[PDB]
Amino acid sequence: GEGDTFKGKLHVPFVPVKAKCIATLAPEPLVEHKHRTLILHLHPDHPT
Amino acid sequence: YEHTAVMPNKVGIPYKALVERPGYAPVHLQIQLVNTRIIPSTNLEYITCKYKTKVPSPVVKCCGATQCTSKPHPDYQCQVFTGVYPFMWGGAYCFCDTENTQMSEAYVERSEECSIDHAKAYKVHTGTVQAMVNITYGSVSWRSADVYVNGETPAKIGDAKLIIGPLSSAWSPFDNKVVVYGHEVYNYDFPEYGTGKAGSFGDLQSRTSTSNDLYANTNLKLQRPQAGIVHTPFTQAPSGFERWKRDKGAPLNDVAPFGCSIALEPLRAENCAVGSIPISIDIPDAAFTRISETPTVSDLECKITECTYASDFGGIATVAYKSSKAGNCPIHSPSGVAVIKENDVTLAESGSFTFHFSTANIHPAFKLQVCTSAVTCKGDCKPPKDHIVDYPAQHTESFT
Amino acid sequence: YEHTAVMPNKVGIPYKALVERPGYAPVHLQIQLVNTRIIPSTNLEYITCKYKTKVPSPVVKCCGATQCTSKPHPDYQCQVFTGVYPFMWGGAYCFCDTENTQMSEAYVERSEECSIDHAKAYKVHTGTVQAMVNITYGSVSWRSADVYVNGETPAKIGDAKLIIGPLSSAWSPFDNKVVVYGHEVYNYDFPEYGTGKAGSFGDLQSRTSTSNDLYANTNLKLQRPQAGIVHTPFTQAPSGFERWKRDKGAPLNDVAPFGCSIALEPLRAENCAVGSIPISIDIPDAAFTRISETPTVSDLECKITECTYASDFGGIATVAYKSSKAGNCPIHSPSGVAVIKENDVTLAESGSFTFHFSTANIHPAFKLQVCTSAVTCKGDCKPPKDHIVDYPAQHTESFT
């Protein structure tokens, strides 16, 4: 409208905040030790 | 008295030092560094986040062009298009066929997400490091002190007086340019304020979250509406903060050497084990006891039971004490070959007691000082078999 | 349009260069920087001010001693006196002559005036330079704006855009440690936090004006009350902050070289003339005019009348012009040998027109750029009569 921009600041109902989400947890690795070397077996279910 | 001594900058190790002030019985001191926060000086540069292209309602004149006004909004783009013929749910609404013009405009505004999701840029100065020293000397056995690192600030904690530092190495994992994103800190090189290129990092830069003015080089571009439909088709580079949000490198929390640690804080660098600290401590004179009162423990003998060439307390040894009186007496090996787990041992009249120890040397030829009585526990050690524990409880390896 | 050129870092003297854009008439330029703020980064170490020995009401037990306790107040000094016999307007206060004891106490707090007058210590980082810059070009403006010195940040008012710096010299007049007192800055080396020896500077140190914790090493010792009179006499060293308030050295604003001044501000050292500034400017193409419209000038010659070998504009020289047109004509001297008082001149056919200038050389041999034409103004000059006057503007002193 060419007349004028009225007031009327409208609050945004759903603002972003920092909440806590439940994140996944990768399956426990299998530790396999050697001399000065750490062989680590892995088998994830999702790319980690 | 003023036991000046340089000790390695580590967390899990007692600095068992003896105070041999003549005229009184020597006393042992234990020093451990619980915290090694660095806290370098910082200065906020600006804040970046994903932007929102707030498009105001366009103004359409049915017959006759309209010159635009250069608004002071950041990256405000304005253009007027000719040959428009908008249909809007009730058919067309301008009876002219050619003089109809739409004025469209747009500008960049910080998103609501900038409040809680926003990167931070900083410049790093030298700063000054602090530490949490734990003192266990004489009979106090407990003292929690937070101290600085400058070689000038004393620590008159309880009754003991301590001076620590300055640190021998000025190493800092933080570089000149650091970027903080919520919880992770990246040593990225943000260019400068007001110079961000579109699409790259810092496409829009704001001095503070509350700063009204900002700088948004986003290469925003308007385009003509097609087929006469009232909208403001704008083409722009994708949000430069969304980029590098999926392409950020490994965090400084996992590339900093010497096993440093960082947190949501003044940006300290906890437990950066590196270098040595010139500790000088003035103990209270009250805790000293006259040399003539302590028992004489001469004519002693030392021999090991078993020793292992291991990171753990792998050494067990027995001493044939030959004392005069009965009481407590602290023990220590001045040589760095081995470390002693025990702090003080009660002696009966010519008793015999065990001690635990650790050493990195196959044949430990180390003196043992027991209330002014030297003895060498020459012996041999045995190789361990397991390769999995925490980092050592001795860790003073030398030639062997 | 991308005119990149280095300029002296001096505040009072403009740098009126002439941009020679091919295919267009040259556009006169003029850049003068009215401010050369340094703005080094700061970090508060502690606040200092004269103490107040706040004595609590003493406690008097009429018959029997009373051991005192160590209260956590800073420098809490307590003693118990014996054998007193206090009179207090209603006769003797206690019947006992020997069992009556007085346990006075005293502790130090920062004085009330510490909220206003208080020395402030600091540590300095590199900081960020800043300038206020004043521009004119062609005939179009007297626009001026606030700008950074880092070689990445542009600044805009009007259509022209420019980038300046970084400074050729990293000279920071502030020392590593500085002290601020009201409006005068002293580069005094405050010792460390919590180590101020009594009587000297920093006798009382607080981490901030609101900090409830403080350090006060003032040698406060209590004294026996005189003549059975109820009072708490204490032996106290003179206020450390009062000292060095009567014998402080010269403030840094009076000993900083290159004529620099400070302020109750982010603590910049403005007008610190040193080094050079690599300024670059992108004049908007709108202000340019095609070379086919301006007057050409022909068969011209130069002739000075009275040149004075002096700091101000004492040289006067007349020129004769065969122009193709009436109109304005930019004038500039590419050589440093002279600087021209008059920015640009107005022409008509076959006229002769005069300008003012200054120079450092006995025999000034400089060429004149009279809107895309050259002429040599040879001549001689004479030294001035009044030696000391106002800061010079000729800025061309070299072998002569």
Curated annotation (Swiss-Prot), chains B, C:
Region of interest called E1 fusion peptide loop, as start-end residue ranges on this chain: 84-101
Post-translational modification, as annotated: N-glycosylated.
Upper lineage: Viruses, Riboviria, Orthornavirae, Kitrinoviricota, Alsuviricetes
Name of the molecule in the record: Spike glycoprotein E1
Domain of life: Viruses
Topological category with respect to the lipid bilayer: Single-pass type I membrane protein
Function: Class II viral fusion protein. Fusion activity is inactive as long as E1 is bound to E2 in mature virion. After virus attachment to target cell and endocytosis, acidification of the endosome would induce dissociation of E1/E2 heterodimer and concomitant trimerization of the E1 subunits. This E1 trimer is fusion active, and promotes release of viral nucleocapsid in cytoplasm after endosome and viral membrane fusion. Efficient fusion requires the presence of cholesterol and sphingolipid in the target membrane.
Extracellular side: 1-400
